[PDB]
Amino acid sequence: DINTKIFNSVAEVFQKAQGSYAGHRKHIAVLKKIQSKAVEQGYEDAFNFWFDKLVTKILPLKKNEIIGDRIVKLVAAFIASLERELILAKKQNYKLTNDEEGIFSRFVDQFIRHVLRGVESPDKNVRFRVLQLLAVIMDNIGEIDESLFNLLILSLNKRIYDREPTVRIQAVFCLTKFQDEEATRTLVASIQNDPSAEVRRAAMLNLINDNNTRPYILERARDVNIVNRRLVYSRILKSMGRKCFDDIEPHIFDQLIEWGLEDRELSVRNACKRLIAHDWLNALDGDLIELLEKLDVSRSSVCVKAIEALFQSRPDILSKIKFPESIWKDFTVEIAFLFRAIYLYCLDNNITEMLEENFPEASKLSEHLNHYILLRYHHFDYNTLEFIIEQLSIAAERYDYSDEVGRRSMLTVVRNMLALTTLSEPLIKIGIRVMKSLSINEKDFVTMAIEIINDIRDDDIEKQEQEEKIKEASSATIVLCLTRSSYMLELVNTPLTENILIASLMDTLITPAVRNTAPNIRELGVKNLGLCCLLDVKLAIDNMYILGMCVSKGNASLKYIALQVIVDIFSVHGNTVVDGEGKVDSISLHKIFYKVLKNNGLPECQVIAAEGLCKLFLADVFTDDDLFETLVLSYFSPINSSNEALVQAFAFCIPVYCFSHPAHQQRMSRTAADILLRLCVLWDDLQSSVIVDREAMLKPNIIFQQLLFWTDPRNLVNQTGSTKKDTVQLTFLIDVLKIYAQIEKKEIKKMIITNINAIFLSSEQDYSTLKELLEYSDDIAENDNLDNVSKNALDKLRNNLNSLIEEINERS
Amino acid sequence: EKDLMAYFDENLNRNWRGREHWKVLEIDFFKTDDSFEDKVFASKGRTKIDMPIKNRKNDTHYLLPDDFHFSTDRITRLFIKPGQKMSLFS
DNA sequence: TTTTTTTTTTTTTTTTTTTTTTT
DNA sequence: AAAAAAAAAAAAAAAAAAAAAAA
């Protein structure tokens, strides 16, 4: 009779506890009192049995339930309150109790052995509830036996490869409790191989940070899920804090910063900006020099996109930053980069107060730059001085030169700097930029650059003639002259007739260097010849067979530069340089483009050729069908599957072309059927090849779907109004149905016929085209032996066509 | 021309990989039963509760490929002269 | 007797941020 | 006053119905 009373009491407690969370302490108290009375009278087995019986009633409940979510928390609180008593008793002094450790151990053992009787139940809700109970009790369990531990590990390692993702999440929540500095090897296997994103997120969040597991955690920064890519920046690195500058490797850190500040999603970029501008800045003492020192500033190019973000979140720090006269003649890389970023951010906006109260004058900046120039090239490491000079030149290139004295001073400084022969390439480039910024018109910078080049050449010639005692310069002199002339020609936008100095430098330097034996001199000469052909049309017409021969016969860099030059010539001028008296025909250039497209040994050349051909097709130049067919085939080719840049370029260049103008969509539809024909042959040979990667090529149904997506008149960006009448997708379907009589296999026929009921059928469409499509579908349905799904699809298509034709017939 | 370029950059932002990714009340604790535990605690029988072996490992590790950023700005400029911008989409 | 794939279609759950609630 | 539970919205993608072979 006492068992009935125990059951009634525990059932009343459970009924009162499932209501709301308010009052979950008196319930624990009365449960403890009932258990104490039961173990004192001598009836604990009945108490355990009835507890298990009443707990079992919450297993069939669905995850989206609160009644079942209260009972698990009640049981967890009961276990925690029952173990905390023993914890406190063992903590403070050594108080002998009335034998409770054994009772607790037996209770946990029997409760674990009872709940594990449904770990392999067919109902997913029961398994979910069992795993959730185990996860919520694993926090408070104490010491257990070896048999129970082995059984638990076996059950978890069996349920980690479960069908339901939620059961797998509960399994990883259970497994993240048995880690130590077998569970780690299981967790790192789910972070890289689990098909569910929530399981990977849970395994990433609930994994210890150690030198052996940190790479696997940081690798999830390029996950296919946006939440997984955001949690690595808004949770992991935030919890690490200052340890990111000590444990994470420099290159991994720079790669993470690049991936964060250059993501295609707004949430990831916002999270990276929040982490950089707020958490990492507040982790220090509010200073910025230490933050710039943590980053590499030098030997990198990410801080330009980082500090700017810091200038968009906290503008107040932008006001406590100065450059007094004392902090001069002793700059580092951080201070120079800071000055550059400050000046650029103040000039890009309208912050004029700082512009007139912080930055010095031009006459002083010229002297400050000349000081470092003299320390470097006339008297602190070399790399630091070069970086400081580069930053100062970048800051001075966009400087306000209203005064004449400062302008003349900076001009003299840049002449004395560019007149050297030890200067590096970036310094030469930024000096050319500053020189262009220090000129009145275009008739002055060109003259100054030509004068500098001629002075260098004449100095070399005079030195050679003087040393001849005790008519062609050396190779290094030609290299420096061509390097200095490339950046000068890159800033000229005027006819070549108005500039006779460039016309002289052509046959004095560029033209003799074009036919040079050395490869680098030849490459620089080809680059200069291209930069000059993009200025005059006669020189561009007369210089094309040499570029064709350079592409056909030449090294990798030579073909690279020559293809770039040809693409730029066609983009600037057009069809004028071809088809005419004394001009290069278009067939030879088309053959060269074909040969460079089919060549797999040079992937970068393929990428450049594809990009240039897409650029030409996007304009009025190059209106051919075979070239477009070859482009689409190279996009859909199993050989070109290794080149990621080519695929990424085509995937962006084809849709914009097809959706820009209806003529482009018509050109695509006129050849998509033959493309599908040539594509269905390569799949058969790939599937029947015994030598391989059979999954490299896309399946024919996906190709047909993508081709139907490109020939849809509803995806046009103009939408004039007559787009509902134009019949572009019908001709493609008719051509596909005509080619259908040439396919050999039956699975290809099936996957082609199944993906037909997806075209645009309206009433404003034509009548004869719909009719012809009807007779074609009828012939295919009759004079053929199809299956069942293809037959049903064809019948549905014929019914739709008949309905549309009967509707159009009732008119006029 | 700027509006069309912005539209093409905004719409084609998530489809940069190509290939196959081209697509745009109250429980009564007093009532006792007998078939409840039999229906809850039982064998799996025929219904499988595990995932296939082929769907357990993947070589791609569910990672994103290297991004090259093919936008309208990159295709508008030239090659050897990034300052000039040819006329397209017009 | 499940299960399995393909096409076509329509929600569902999560996470962050606020209000109440219980001492 | 501090910690926990409940509720509304945005963000972002997994989930499901139908039909014909397959073990």
Side-chain angles (χ1 to χ4, degrees), chain A residues 756-773:
Chain A
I756 295 178
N757 275 334
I759 64 163
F760 178 63
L761 288 164
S762 178
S763 280
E764 291 87 5
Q765 296 220 327
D766 209 316
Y767 184 70
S768 200
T769 314
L770 276 180
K771 185 183 286 185
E772 201 166 10
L773 192 58

Side-chain angles (χ1 to χ4, degrees), chain A residues 470-490:
Chain A
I470 305 100
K471 314 302 297 307
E472 182 66 27
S474 306
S475 305
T477 290
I478 303 298
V479 166
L480 311 185
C481 289
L482 289 181
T483 305
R484 282 165 164 78
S485 171
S486 59
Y487 305 129
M488 183 278 288
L489 294 174
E490 270 177 39

Side-chain angles (χ1 to χ4, degrees), chain A residues 21 70 73 225-226 267 788-789:
Chain A
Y21 284 90
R70 264 141 191 171
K73 215 161 291 183
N225 207 66
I226 314 183
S267 65
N788 277 67
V789 193

Side-chain angles (χ1 to χ4, degrees), chain A residues 547-592:
Chain A
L547 288 161
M549 294 299 291
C550 278
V551 178
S552 314
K553 294 181 176 67
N555 323 296
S557 298
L558 192 64
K559 296 155 85 82
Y560 211 65
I561 297 169
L563 259 183
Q564 275 176 71
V565 160
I566 291 155
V567 164
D568 293 310
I569 281 169
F570 272 102
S571 296
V572 170
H573 297 303
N575 274 316
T576 302
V577 296
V578 293
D579 271 26
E581 293 179 353
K583 298 197 223 165
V584 170
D585 205 354
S586 282
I587 301 299
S588 69
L589 297 172
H590 288 191
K591 204 172 321 303
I592 296 169

